[PDB]
Amino acid sequence: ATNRDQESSGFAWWAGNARLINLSGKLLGAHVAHAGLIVFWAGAMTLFELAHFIPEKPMYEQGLILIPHIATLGWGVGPGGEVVDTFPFFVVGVVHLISSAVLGFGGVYHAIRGPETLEEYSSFFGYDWKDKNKMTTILGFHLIVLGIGALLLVAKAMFFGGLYDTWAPGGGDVRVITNPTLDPRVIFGYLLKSPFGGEGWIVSVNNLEDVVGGHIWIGLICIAGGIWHILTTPFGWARRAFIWSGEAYLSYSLGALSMMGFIATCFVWFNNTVYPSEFYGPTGPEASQAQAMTFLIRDQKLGANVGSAQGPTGLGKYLMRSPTGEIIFGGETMRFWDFRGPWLEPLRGPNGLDLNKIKNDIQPWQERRAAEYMTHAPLGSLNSVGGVATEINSVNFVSPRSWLATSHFVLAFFFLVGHLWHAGRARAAAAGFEKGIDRESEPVLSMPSLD
Amino acid sequence: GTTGERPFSDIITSVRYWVIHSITIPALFIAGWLFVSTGLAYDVFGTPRPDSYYAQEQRSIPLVTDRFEAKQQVETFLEQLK
Amino acid sequence: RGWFDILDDWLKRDRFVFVGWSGILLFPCAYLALGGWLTGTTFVTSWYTHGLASSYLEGCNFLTVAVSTPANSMGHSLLLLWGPEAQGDFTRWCQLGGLWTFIALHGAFGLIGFMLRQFEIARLVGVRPYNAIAFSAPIAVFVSVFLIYPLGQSSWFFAPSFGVAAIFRFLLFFQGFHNWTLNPFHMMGVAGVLGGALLCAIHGATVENTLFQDGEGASTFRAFNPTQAEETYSMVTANRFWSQIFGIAFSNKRWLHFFMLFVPVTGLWMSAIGVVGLALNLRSYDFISQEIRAAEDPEFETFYTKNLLLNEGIRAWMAPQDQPHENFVFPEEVLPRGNAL
Amino acid sequence: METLKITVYIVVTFFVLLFVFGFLSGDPARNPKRKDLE
Amino acid sequence: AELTPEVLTVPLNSEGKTITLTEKQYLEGKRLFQYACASCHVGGITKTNPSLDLRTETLALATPPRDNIEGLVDYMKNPTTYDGEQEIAEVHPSLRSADIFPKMRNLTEKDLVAIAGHILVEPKILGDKWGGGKVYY
Amino acid sequence: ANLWERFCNWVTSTDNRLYVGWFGVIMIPTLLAATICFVIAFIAAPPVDIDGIREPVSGSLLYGNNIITGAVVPSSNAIGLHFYPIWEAASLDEWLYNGGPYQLIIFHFLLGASCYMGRQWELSYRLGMRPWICVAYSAPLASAFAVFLIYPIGQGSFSDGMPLGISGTFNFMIVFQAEHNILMHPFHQLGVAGVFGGALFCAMHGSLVTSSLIRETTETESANYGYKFGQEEETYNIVAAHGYFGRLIFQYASFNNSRSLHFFLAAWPVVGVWFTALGISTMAFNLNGFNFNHSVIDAKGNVINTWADIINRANLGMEVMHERNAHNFPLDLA
Ligand code: CLA
Ligand code: CLA
Ligand code: CLA
Ligand code: CLA
Ligand code: CLA
Ligand SMILES: CCCCCCCCCCCCCCCC(=O)OC[C@H](COP(=O)(O)OC[C@@H](O)CO)OC(=O)CCCCCCCCCCCCCCC
Ligand SMILES: CC1=C(/C=C/C(C)=C/C=C/C(C)=C/C=C/C=C(C)/C=C/C=C(C)/C=C/C2=C(C)CCCC2(C)C)C(C)(C)CCC1
Ligand SMILES: CC1=C(/C=C/C(C)=C/C=C/C(C)=C/C=C/C=C(C)/C=C/C=C(C)/C=C/C2=C(C)CCCC2(C)C)C(C)(C)CCC1
Ligand SMILES: CC1=C(/C=C/C(C)=C/C=C/C(C)=C/C=C/C=C(C)/C=C/C=C(C)/C=C/C2=C(C)CCCC2(C)C)C(C)(C)CCC1
Ligand SMILES: CCCCCCCCCCCCO[C@@H]1O[C@H](CO)[C@@H](O[C@H]2O[C@H](CO)[C@@H](O)[C@H](O)[C@H]2O)[C@H](O)[C@H]1O
Ligand SMILES: CCCCCCCCCCCCCCCCCC(=O)O
Ligand code: OEX
Ligand SMILES: [Cl-]
Ligand SMILES: [Cl-]
Ligand SMILES: [Fe+2]
């Protein structure tokens, strides 16, 4: 029981995992076991979703979050997102589960039975947190692996089946991407776009060509950067800029992951390209716009001249102008005039929504889709009662977009707290005062008074 | 310092404690269960059963409206249930 | 020794749970209040007093169960089990809401007993009585809310019912009918509560981050000994930090801790005064100048007038079911409503 | 309005650059106990 | 009160003949109604067209009359506008549009009868609440 | 030393009456801008068309408000989440009509408050303290982010951010209850536990220390003069305080360790407020409080009301009355 008590390690049980900071073998075992946990959940949860899946009903009516991910990749679904074959879902679940068993075996071995420290057994796998060269070597290895993952996505899109394209001409379909966007102007203009309304930063990516080109660039850049960090060691300015310790590296990663969690929240809330509404349900903006469209259709069928219908406030009841003049839906949904979706874009012309097209060319499938989205807006209670808070019990529905956004905002925030905690502690421990103030050399006592 | 009572950990890790309580705890739990499943709770506390909130064709609540006749009003409501 | 002195000895024995003379009042009353709440929430209905289901036995959950107030027709009756209403019939007593007055009265006397316990223990161990003094705020809140307010209103019916959701309904009723948020006494109460939470957090964190290193462990809790004479954290360093961060800082620990007593206690007392006012419908409901201006000028609008519209909605839509004794029938056409909703 | 926009861009860039280069200017060594943190 | 056979007895055709639904029938109807219809018709209102509701009187005044089991089954097979002038299977769920409304694909004749029975019974239980909207919540 | 070296030494100096630091270099200008704009707007700004329906709401003192009713009004629903700096307006008149001051103020404030947290860390580092006071500050800061940025992002408009005023805050709260039933949401319940318990424990700790002060003064002098700033010995008897509180409840319910005690004081309210901030930030994506409307039904099928149904009636009143001219269609979907 080496270092497995507070007396010998300096750490209490509630901080026990800090006892592993300098025990590389047991720490590797811990990480492999936790990765086994991740893979195991993927497999078990996917199998649970499949066992509870009713193929006829939309995915988003059934509390599914993983099956939509598989379907978006083009597996198991056909035109309009209809499910034609669930065996790909089942295969994903089974394979992840078996792999989880293997990972668990490896992690338990490295954590319980294998060498406690790897430095003696091997210098290739052993490391010292303060060895910047070795640290950057491991970082580069994992960068190469990640780049390979991005290129795997590219391969799925281009050579093995393609991706589900909600924008495909005909009403959404699996499509093979053959002309990925390699234009750096486009790819990095995305990064330079403002995050505010009508711009949306990277969350605004609205076509699979741009998606695939972006991931091509990510894979190549990651491979090059990993080779770079294998072959180099940090320069002097970096050496003087950073804290070089295990806890510091953990803190940096906590900050990065928090940022990624917030970004994912926005992605799933706003983007209906890589999160097709056929699978994840309408976005909030989409559902609001859909209500506007639905009642425009109903009243116009009754005989209203929607272009000229004046609302109570003087603004158009059904149609008005955005602050830059585009014709848009009226009512509160004026805030959502940046929304774009395949069921709505056929009605849009150069100046915005086109009155002639609204009057003459709205199709039954558009009417049906608008009704569906209006009635599956992402609003619901914690016990999964669909609709506004004042609605009565009857509909058992909370949108996958709501579940995913809320969960990952919670995770991103707590990981920001983690970044702050571990970064502050890393600084204090590197400087040597993380256990408190030295009584005989209290820094403040040697400073001049403020007044 | 301690006040002389036997330690709780000592008591709850002892064979005699569990000899006694493996009988007593289940008995009390079953007593409560039966208190409900036999319907005695309804009678004791005057709580309506699912079929006793309304008369068959009634939709008005049996609200007590007189302070000193409230007991008789409740009894009249109960009779009207029949 | 005399029997009084022998009894004093036994009551003040040092045992796991101290009893004391105050115990003779505290323990039966506190037990009866708590047990009454659990009993009512588990088995008792609110059908004959409110037209509501309020117990686990009827199908409510922890958030919706309650021991509900008696019917409005009961007035302010004590509703004693042997009283003229229940006439010694336990089942009828429960159906008439005697459990609410039972809980409220045994709980009030239990609070008296607990404060007496604070005094008695302080006297026995030789400390000053400031914990008992600070407890006056919870007692003032309880008295003002659960006894004085209903005593000023038509009956116990409008006191808070002992339950989670029932308390929430109490909040919303106060907003809708009293415009309680606009009341400067509630505002001072809010300041006291939130400032107390702020002081609690900031002081805890400051101590924990100005600790002296008094041991080698990375977990710093073992480096304190209760009998030690030295301060465990650096007041000088904490004062320097807060002076440079926020401009001002504490420099006197005694003042710091008295201030921690003073803030939340004073806030709760102020809120109690406000509720005494509301017992008489003596509200901070309106600003007369704004009302005159708005009446004369249909383009004048502020968040104050918006909130008044919200209150009118609350009253109209909740009164018929929340006040069943009034027999309100509001035809649909009279309900206030905005466009389309 | 264009002059205002350019002025604000210049000011913000000034302060942000101060932030970045200041934290690059050997910040870890600016503590009372141990300087050589690499 | 109880869910009695008298409550469960509802009109069967346009000639006044009545049928007595079983309690299992009524519960199955409620479940199927939640499954296939409540997204728009929760509580008897119509979210995407509030002017039309599922109240028995409204069904009675519909053309053809829909205040009986057979009328409601026919509506679910071949829905029409209120005056019966237009067939709206293209925009309303039905067996003949089950290809575009998949939740209708597996419904059987007994299932449709159960849904219709639920629609007719629920107002007998809830009164104005059925089709009344938020005013009566 | 070179000019840059001297400037860095001044910026990071621990001898300045108010610490500046690198976080302060961002904090000072942004907080000054936010403060100046807020004060000017609160006093003098003209009415703002918050809901985008050409119905301006008056927020400023000079336009008929008092301290309780005044506010800086959120930007127009016509703007949504669009960035609306002064230079995006055709004129200051347009900017004011559309509520640009709100955006300027809240953005500069959020940035400055983030830098305030960082500055707490930085000065702790300069003074050789432990670093986690900033972690305590992250709770209220997270709450500010939730009500000024996250909720607007989720709902699609800064017009739904909390107004910068007292009555505006109340309006925000009431509408929030109408649309999300926050009272029935466990995270707000944890927030209430956090703040009620924070106040409770504040009073408890203050009262216990005050009750255990050691005699160093006479009855004609404030007991506070019994403590001298920077004295080595403790000023109260924690052993006596523990004897009292342990006998008040029972021995093992009372802290005998001051460090554990102060950690608990920090942790309770901070965690509670973290959770309430998450409650707002998750209801931003329309995951609302528990809905038990009509959960209890009798044998026939009659609805048996509960206190939750009464709450629902109140919520309906709020919902139907709020923003009375802004809705054209039956559902309020954001
Ligand atoms: C990659 C993520 C990561 C990693 C690897 C670490 C690793 C570490 N942290 Mg850091 N931490 C993180 C994220 C991370 N942390 C985040 C996000 C936060 C913010 C909350 C913190 C906050 C934090 C603090 C405050 C401290 C550490 C400490 C530590 C060390 C000991 C941890 C331990 O033994 O826990 C033991 C684990 C437990 C005691 C169990 C905790 C269970 C949590 C609180 C509840 C989880 C609920 C669950 C999700 C859902 C439950 C469902 C139920 C409600 C039904 C270790 C070096 C300690 C340290 O400084 O050591 C040097 C320390 O004091 N961490
Ligand atoms: C993902 C979560 C996770 C992981 C991977 C680890 C991993 C580890 N912890 Mg940590 N820990 C955690 C959570 C976690 N911990 C939490 C939540 C707490 C707070 C309660 C702690 C508190 C804590 C302390 C206080 C200590 C550790 C220690 C350790 C290490 C040695 C454990 C040991 O000696 O086991 C001994 C235990 C056993 C022999 C019992 C059996 C354990 C096995 C692994 C169960 C596996 C079951 C599994 C189903 C088998 C599948 C096999 C199949 C695939 C074939 C190990 C690397 C110790 C350490 O660092 O030592 C240097 C240490 O002292 N941990
Ligand atoms: C990142 C995870 C990781 C890392 C860094 C290590 C590292 C190490 N392990 Mg451990 N191990 C792991 C996972 C890991 N292992 C898992 C998951 C298992 C369970 C099967 C084991 C089971 C295991 C045993 C039983 C033993 C080791 C031993 C060793 C040491 C020698 C390994 C060697 O020479 O490789 C030789 C290289 C190979 C055999 C080729 C590996 C390439 C694989 C098969 C495919 C390509 C890799 C690819 C990226 C995998 C993708 C998986 C993805 C889905 C996650 C070394 C310290 C030995 C030791 O400690 O000696 C004292 C030892 O006896 N490991
Ligand atoms: C997991 C990813 C990862 C990580 C952790 C690192 C880590 C590191 N790299 Mg490597 N790098 C990577 C991937 C990564 N790299 C890849 C993929 C490439 C290929 C393009 C490189 C290419 C590369 C080079 C060429 C160099 C490094 C260097 C370094 C070191 C200094 C980093 C630094 O100062 O950053 C902090 C960054 C800065 C100080 C400059 C930019 C700071 C701006 C102002 C921040 C902008 C934030 C933005 C405005 C806010 C929103 C973000 C939004 C745009 C997403 C450090 C060890 C340096 C070194 O010493 O290596 C020998 C070096 O010269 N890296
Ligand atoms: C210290 C303990 C204590 C206290 C302060 C109270 C206080 C109260 N109880 Mg609770 N009660 C207690 C213990 C206590 N109870 C216990 C242990 C039980 C369980 C047995 C109960 C069971 C209980 C029930 C069931 C009810 C109460 C009720 C009440 C209220 C009315 C009491 C009343 O009118 O008494 C009046 C009695 C006295 C003031 C005693 C006077 C004693 C003098 C000396 C008598 C002198 C004359 C007399 C004829 C002596 C004759 C001597 C000779 C001729 C033989 C009051 C709030 C009622 C309530 O809550 O209503 C809503 C109610 O219904 N109590
Ligand atoms: C030393 C503690 C310092 C840490 C601070 C604690 C944080 C706060 C914890 C509070 C809850 C305590 C959890 C126990 C913390 C703990 O350490 O537990 C251990 C403690 C003592 O356990 P043992 O008897 O095993 O003690 C071993 C001893 O030999 C020495 O430890 O157990 C109890 O006190 C639990 C008994 C429940 C007693 C229920 C009695 C009910 C009586 C009802 C009347 C009440 C009085 C009413 C007054 C009006
Ligand atoms: C170290 C440590 C730890 C951790 C641990 C872990 C984390 C582990 C993991 C583990 C794992 C991670 C495991 C795994 C497992 C797995 C398995 C064992 C699997 C199996 C599978 C199967 C058997 C399948 C089957 C099937 C199929 C194939 C098809 C479908 C159906 C079914 C499902 C039946 C703790 C915390 C305790 C603490 C101490 C130390
Ligand atoms: C995939 C994809 C794409 C693309 C993407 C990309 C291309 C990306 C990139 C990205 C990137 C490229 C990023 C970057 C980032 C960076 C960062 C995030 C940084 C940070 C930094 C830091 C953190 C710093 C710090 C500091 C300072 C500032 C001062 C001094 C000290 C220190 C150093 C600490 C797209 C959209 C097209 C589409 C979809 C898909
Ligand atoms: C009123 C009255 C009375 C009294 C009564 C009593 C005294 C009662 C009591 C009762 C009681 C005394 C009851 C109790 C009950 C209890 C319960 C019912 C409990 C529950 C619990 C729970 C459910 C919990 C849970 C949990 C969680 C969740 C987590 C953590 C852990 C725990 C376990 C805590 C007399 C006779 C004078 C007559 C007149 C009237
Ligand atoms: C917008 C992009 C901005 C960030 C771009 C990335 C820049 C990365 C490379 C820049 C390197 C800066 O290099 C860094 O310069 C500073 C300031 O002179 C040096 O700082 C050093 O000299 C200065 C004097 O000027 C002293 O005040 C300081 O205490 C000392 O550390 C650092 O030792 C060096 O590491
Ligand atoms: C101060 C101490 C107060 C203690 C009061 C204990 C109360 C115990 C009451 C139990 C008996 C109730 C009498 C029931 C019969 C009364 C019927 C009637 O004549 O009205
Ligand atoms: O702006 Mn403010 O408050 Ca949110 O929900 Mn819709 O939008 Mn309006 O209505 Mn309700
Ligand atoms: Cl409003
Ligand atoms: Cl609208
Ligand atoms: Fe203290």
Swiss-Prot record, chain A:
Superkingdom of the source species: Bacteria
Chain ranges passing through the membrane: 39-61, 102-123, 146-168, 223-243, 259-279, 415-439
HAMAP family reported in the protein's UniProt record: PSII_PsbC_CP43 (MF_01496)
Family label: Belongs to the PsbB/PsbC family. PsbC subfamily.
Co-factor remark: Binds multiple chlorophylls and provides some of the ligands for the Ca-4Mn-5O cluster of the oxygen-evolving complex. It may also provide a ligand for a Cl- that is required for oxygen evolution. PSII binds additional chlorophylls, carotenoids and specific lipids.
UniProt keywords, alphabetically: Chlorophyll, Chromophore, Manganese, Membrane, Metal-binding, Photosynthesis, Photosystem II, Thylakoid, Transmembrane, Transmembrane helix
Any one annotated GO CC term: plasma membrane-derived thylakoid membrane
Organism of derivation: Thermosynechococcus vestitus (strain NIES-2133 / IAM M-273 / BP-1)
Protein name in the entry: Photosystem II CP43 reaction center protein
Chain positions recorded as [CaMn4O5] cluster binding sites: 345
Side Lumenal, residues: 62-101, 169-222, 280-414
Compartment(s): Cellular thylakoid membrane
Record's bilayer topology term: Multi-pass membrane protein
From Swiss-Prot, chain B:
Gene name per UniProt: psbE
Record PROSITE patterns: CYTOCHROME_B559 (PS00537)
Subunit description: Heterodimer of an alpha subunit and a beta subunit. PSII is composed of 1 copy each of membrane proteins PsbA, PsbB, PsbC, PsbD, PsbE, PsbF, PsbH, PsbI, PsbJ, PsbK, PsbL, PsbM, PsbT, PsbX, PsbY, PsbZ, Psb30/Ycf12, peripheral proteins PsbO, CyanoQ (PsbQ), PsbU, PsbV and a large number of cofactors. It forms dimeric complexes. Part of a photosystem II (PSII) assembly intermediate complex PSII-I; crystallized from a strain deleted of psbJ, it forms monomeric PSII before addition of the oxygen evolving complex. PSII-I includes 3 assembly factors not found in mature PSII (Psb27, Psb28 and Psb34).
GO molecular function terms attached to this record: electron transfer activity; heme binding; iron ion binding
Chief place of localization: membrane
Residues engaged in binding heme: 21
Role this protein plays: This b-type cytochrome is tightly associated with the reaction center of photosystem II (PSII). PSII is a light-driven water:plastoquinone oxidoreductase that uses light energy to abstract electrons from H(2)O, generating O(2) and a proton gradient subsequently used for ATP formation. It consists of a core antenna complex that captures photons, and an electron transfer chain that converts photonic excitation into a charge separation.
UniProt topological domain (Cytoplasmic) ranges: 1-16
Cofactor binding, per record: With its partner (PsbF) binds heme. PSII binds additional chlorophylls, carotenoids and specific lipids.
Cofactor: heme b
Keyword Transmembrane: yes
From Swiss-Prot, chain C:
EC number: 1.10.3.9
Lumenal side: 43-97, 150-182, 278-341
Binding site for chlorophyll a PD2: 186
SUPFAM superfamilies: Bacterial photosystem II reaction centre, L and M subunits (SSF81483)
Record's subcellular location: Cellular thylakoid membrane
A biological process from GO: photosynthetic electron transport in photosystem II
Membrane topology term: Multi-pass membrane protein
Gene Ontology CC: photosystem II; plasma membrane-derived thylakoid membrane
Single annotated GO MF: chlorophyll binding
UniProt-annotated binding residues for pheophytin a: 118, 131
Binding-site residues for chlorophyll a ChlzD2, renumbered to this chain: 106
Keywords: Chlorophyll, Chromophore, Electron transport, Iron, Magnesium, Membrane, Metal-binding, Oxidoreductase, Photosynthesis, Photosystem II, Thylakoid, Transmembrane, Transmembrane helix, Transport
Reaction(s) the record says it catalyses: 2 a plastoquinone + 4 hnu + 2 H2O = 2 a plastoquinol + O2
Transmembrane segments: 21-42, 98-120, 130-149, 183-206, 255-277
Entries under Pfam families matching the protein: Photo_RC (PF00124)
Binding site for Fe cation: 203, 257
Broad EC category: oxidoreductase
InterPro entries: D1/D2 (IPR055266), Photo_II_D1/D2_sf (IPR036854), Photo_RC_L/M (IPR000484), Photo_RC_L/M_CS (IPR055265), PSII_PsbD/D2 (IPR005868)
Residues bound to a plastoquinone: 203, 250
Other known facts: 2 of the reaction center chlorophylls (ChlD1 and ChlD2) are entirely coordinated by water.
Similarity comment text for this entry: Belongs to the reaction center PufL/M/PsbA/D family.
Record's protein name: Photosystem II D2 protein
Organism of provenance: Thermosynechococcus vestitus (strain NIES-2133 / IAM M-273 / BP-1)
Gene that this sequence comes from: psbD1
Curated annotation (Swiss-Prot), chain F:
Marked site positions, Tyrosine radical intermediate: 151
Transmembrane domains' residue ranges: 22-43, 101-122, 133-153, 182-207, 263-285
Subcellular location: Cellular thylakoid membrane
Membrane topology summary: Multi-pass membrane protein
Primary subcellular site in the record, as a coarse category: membrane
E.C. number(s) listed in UniProt: 1.10.3.9
Domain of life from the UniProt record: Bacteria
Cofactor binding note: The D1/D2 heterodimer binds P680, chlorophylls that are the primary electron donor of PSII, and subsequent electron acceptors. It shares a non-heme iron and each subunit binds pheophytin, quinone, additional chlorophylls, carotenoids and lipids. D1 provides most of the ligands for the Mn4-Ca-O5 cluster of the oxygen-evolving complex (OEC). There is also a Cl(-1) ion associated with D1 and D2, which is required for oxygen evolution. PSII binds additional chlorophylls, carotenoids and specific lipids.
Keywords: Calcium, Chlorophyll, Chromophore, Electron transport, Herbicide resistance, Iron, Magnesium, Manganese, Membrane, Metal-binding, Oxidoreductase, Photosynthesis, Photosystem II, Thylakoid, Transmembrane, Transmembrane helix, Transport
Binding site for chlorophyll a ChlzD1: 108
Binding positions for [CaMn4O5] cluster per the UniProt entry: 160, 179, 322-323, 332, 334
Cytoplasmic side: 1-21, 123-132, 208-262
Catalysed reactions, as listed in the record: 2 a plastoquinone + 4 hnu + 2 H2O = 2 a plastoquinol + O2
GO BP: photosynthetic electron transport in photosystem II; response to herbicide
Residues involved in a quinone binding: 205, 254-255
Record-linked SUPFAM superfamilies: Bacterial photosystem II reaction centre, L and M subunits
Sequence similarity: Belongs to the reaction center PufL/M/PsbA/D family.
Name this protein carries in UniProt: Photosystem II protein D1 1
Gene name for this UniProt entry: psbA1
